[PDB]
Amino acid sequence: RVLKKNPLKNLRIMLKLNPYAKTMRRNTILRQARNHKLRVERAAAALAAKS
Amino acid sequence: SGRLWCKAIFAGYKRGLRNQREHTALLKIEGVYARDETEFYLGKRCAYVYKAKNNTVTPGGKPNKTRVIWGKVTRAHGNSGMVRAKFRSNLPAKAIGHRIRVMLYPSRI
């Protein structure tokens, strides 16, 4: 009997089933990092325009 | 040199109206009255404490009449800051409406 570990939680299990998830989830960290930065620079440009 | 346990009552066992379930107490903790002001207590160590005729041992001490059933505040019971605990034996019902010392000492603070 094989323990079903939940892929949604268990990163590696997900990959063993669906290997492409590594790439998808490489992005949408990086994609979000990108977008977080951009919002800081917008907030900086709004504070500078206010000054 | 003073008290190091927040006071709490043992209000009874977890239960539906006509079916009791002994293995799961309901502690009313002194001064906490919202399923909001009861995160703190989750995870904490709690003790029904009492004494009896025959002596017992005591950690860090000579033998003594006092005994406890240790426990653990497990989760947060219905709305009005009542809580649930789960003790290592089930509490004895003699206890119903007495003190059970809730500690601070599995802290997440």
Binding site: - | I9, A11, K28, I96, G97, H98
Partner: protein, 199 residues
Amino acid sequence: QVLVLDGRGHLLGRLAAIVAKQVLLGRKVVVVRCEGINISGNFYRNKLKYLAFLRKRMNTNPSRGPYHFRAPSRIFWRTVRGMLPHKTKRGQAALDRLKVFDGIPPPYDKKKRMVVPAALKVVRLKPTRKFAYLGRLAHEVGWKYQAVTATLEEKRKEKAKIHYRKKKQLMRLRKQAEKNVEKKIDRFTEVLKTHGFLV
């Protein structure tokens, strides 16, 4: 460790509720000046409703019967006992913590005596509604010791006036003493108003 509630200006079954639940958690509760307690709905109404309760009795042997206490203390204590499990041991154990009084006698005349606002008439009734005073209701239903309770309580309130007056005098002395002293307590009192008192 003891709850002393001034029964005055509460709603009979409202305060009872709180008391019951307290008493079962193991709080020794004392209610006091019950005859002040006031029951919602108009008087005649409630007198009639007590008079039902007096109509109730075991035919064959009244002596065994529902014991209609007339004293407004008892009357409150009866209505707590209706909100307890009093046949059990734990319900009777609880009921032995409740202590009730017709007026307010010596151990608790000199005690800061609480109020439950959730039971309070001025909070729970609309102000355009009628309500009995229990004192009256007891009286008309057979309670004796109304006048005696009243006339002891005048003597209580007179004695209390004096206590209060003398308290007021000490408070005035303190206020004056702080004004005398302020400059030599400045670098305490300051800290108590940086950490949120005095203001």
